[PDB]
């Protein structure tokens, strides 16, 4: 049972590092991304009309 | 005995343009021949598209995702009722 | 040294957890990354020339 307990110790210990790094790339990609699709699309239908 | 400008003005009534307003459109095309502005109507069309995109950006995301085919002529009537001023 | 061994094994397990997702992504990434520029670029010069 102790072994099982430190199993989850290590699981969260490394999953936290994975989570923070993935959050870093998420912040970068969110700054790069926003929601610019609708801006692209709206001019498209405006021009076609 | 009928002016060509009068002819185009009256013939712009049968049909309603998808986004362009029909009455200011006739006004601009008539102005082309009236004051001899060889390059007139492109300012009108660019202003119209710039105003239309700005107006549509003011709406919520739910409204635009649900539809866009109706808001364009809604803002078109907005444009004509502005043109009277 | 007990807690040391289970820390090592938990590191192993979380590492196996992390590597698989990156391999899965990299399959699709490598499938479409290399070719497209090769044709695109040369046609750009060709056409503008």
């Amino acid at each position: 049972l102790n072994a099982d307990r430190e199993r989850l110790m290590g699981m969260m210990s490394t999953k936290d590092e994975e989570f923070r790094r993935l959050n870093e790339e998420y912040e970068l990609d969110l700054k790069d991304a926003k929601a610019k699709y609708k801006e692209t699309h709206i001019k498209v239908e405006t021009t076609k009309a | 005995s009928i002016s060509v400008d009068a002819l185009v003005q009256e013939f712009f009534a049968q049909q309603s343009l998808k986004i362009l307003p029909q009455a200011p459109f006739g006004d601009a095309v008539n102005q082309f021949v009236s004051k001899d502005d060889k390059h007139a109507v492109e300012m009108f069309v660019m202003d119209s598209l710039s105003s239309q995109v700005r107006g549509l950006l003011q709406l919520d995301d739910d409204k635009i995702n649900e539809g866009l085919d109706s808001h364009i002529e809604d803002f078109r009537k907005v444009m004509e009722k502005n043109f009277l001023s």
Side-chain angles (χ1 to χ4, degrees), chain A residues 38 41-43 45-46 49, chain B residues 19 52-53 56-57 61 68:
Chain A
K38 61 172 72 68
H41 186 273
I42 51 183
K43 287 63 151 183
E45 82 269 3
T46 302
Chain B
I19 64 142
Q52 196 272 335
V53 65
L56 61 83
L57 293 174
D61 298 330
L68 294 174

Side-chain angles (χ1 to χ4, degrees), chain B residues 12-27:
Chain B
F12 292 165
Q14 277 81 20
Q15 55 277 347
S16 178
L17 295 174
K18 299 330 183 181
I19 64 142
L20 286 183
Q22 50 200 22
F25 182 76
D27 173 61

